[PDB]
């Protein structure tokens, strides 16, 4: 008699592990707090630094990474103009290693991730399928660019540190319990 309902969460960062574990595939999530962008080059450099024991200038632990190459303009401050998703599968080779040491984390992108990633997320992480449009209107939920690191990778590949309010919507598409909307 308990009907399945779609839950909506405004998840605050730094993430609370129990709130990640409560998520089910098909739930609606908005993010409020800090997120950072990273795609192919940043993940490659992160793995390189991690294996050499060099501290990263950001932290995956309790964080939300957005697979995104943003368009940013600089007036008095940096301003994000577009923040649309990139295809997450390109990050499949890097992501299990990154998940290894985190207590919990969240990942936003499009198209989903491999079964290796699904397994690596068990008990610790979720994947949020971005469903907030092309990226221009979504950028209006970004209130501040806190900073940028690894700018030498070029604007879309740099790691942008963003302060957001109700960034989304996203749909939980891989949970912390071995479920994936993308399976088969």
Q: Is 4 noted as a catalytic residue in this protein? A: no
Method: X-ray
Q: Report which DSSP code applies to 158.
A: S
Q: Which residue out of 2, 3, 43, 67 is catalytically annotated?
A: 43
Resolution in A: 1.7
CATH number of the domain residue 73 falls in: 3.20.130.10
Into how many domains does the chain fold? 1
Q: Does residue 101 sit in helix, strand or coil?
A: coil
Q: How far apart are the first and last CA of the chain?
A: 30
98 DSSP assignment: H
Q: Which of 126, 123, 131 is CA-nearest to residue 172?
A: 126
**Closest Cα partner for 30 from 11, 15, 17, 14?**
11
Q: Which domain holds residue 9?
A: 1-184
Partner residues linked to 34 by β-bridges: 163
- By CB atoms closer than 10 A (0-12, 13-18, 19+), residue 154 is exposed
With tokens 């399976």, the residue in question is 183
CA angle 41, 173, 128 (to 5 degrees): 50
Buried b (16+ CB within 10 A) or exposed e, 10-40: ebebebebeebeebebebbbbbbbbbbbbbb
Query: Burial letters for 65-77: b for 16+ Cβ neighbours within 10 Å, e otherwise?
Result: bbbbbbbbeeeee
In eight-state DSSP terms, residue 6 is -
Of 166, 99, 155, give the one whose Cα is nearest residue 126. 99
Q: For the chain, how are helix, strand and coil distributed in percent, rounded to 5?
A: 25, 35, 40
Alpha-carbon torsion 52, 53, 55, 56, what sign?
A: positive
């Amino acid at each position: 008699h308990h009907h399945h309902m779609v839950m909506e969460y405004e998840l605050r960062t730094p993430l609370v592990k129990d709130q990640i574990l409560k998520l089910k595939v098909g739930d609606v999530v908005y993010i409020t707090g800090e997120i950072f962008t990273a795609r192919d080059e940043a993940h490659a450099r992160a793995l390189e630094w991690m294996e050499e024991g060099k501290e990263l200038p950001f932290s995956f632990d309790k964080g939300v990474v957005y697979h995104c190459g943003p368009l940013v303009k600089k007036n008095d401050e940096w301003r994000v103009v577009s923040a649309g998703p990139t295809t997450s599968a390109r990050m499949n080779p890097f992501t299990p290693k990154i998940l290894e040491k985190v207590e919990c984390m969240g990942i936003i992108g499009k198209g989903g991730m491999s079964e290796e990633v699904v397994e690596a997320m068990r008990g610790k992480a979720a994947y949020f399928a971005f469903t907030g449009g092309a990226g221009a209107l979504a950028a209006m939920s970004i209130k501040k660019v806190k900073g940028v690191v690894w700018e030498d990778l070029g604007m879309p590949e740099a790691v942008w540190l963003l302060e957001v309010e109700r960034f989304g919507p996203c749909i939980v598409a891989i949970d912390a319990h071995g479920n994936s909307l993308y399976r088969r």
